[PDB]
Amino acid sequence: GFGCPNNYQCHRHCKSIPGRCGGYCGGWHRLRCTCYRCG
């Protein structure tokens, strides 16, 4: 989902999410987009 395991599509989803900076496809069969909070 969220354009996985594509890094560009997964990163685009993390960018639209508020309180984040980047992300990656991993968690559920490399299909979930895991984004981290920007420091």
Curated annotation (Swiss-Prot):
Keywords: Amidation, Antibiotic, Antimicrobial, Defensin, Disulfide bond, Hydroxylation, Immunity, Innate immunity, Secreted. Disulfide bonds join C4-C25, C10-C33, C14-C35, C21-C38. The modification 3-hydroxytryptophan is found at W28. Abundantly expressed in hemocytes. It is found in: Secreted. One of its GO terms (cellular component) is extracellular region. The modification Cysteine amide is found at C38. Its main location: secreted. Induction: Its expression is increased by bacterial challenge. The hydroxylation of the Trp-28 is not important for the antibacterial activity. One of its GO terms (biological process) is innate immune response. Active against both Gram-positive and Gram-negative bacteria but is not cytotoxic towards human erythrocytes or protozoa. Belongs to the invertebrate defensin family. Type 2 subfamily. The Cys-4-Pro-5 bond is in cis conformation. This is Defensin MGD-1.
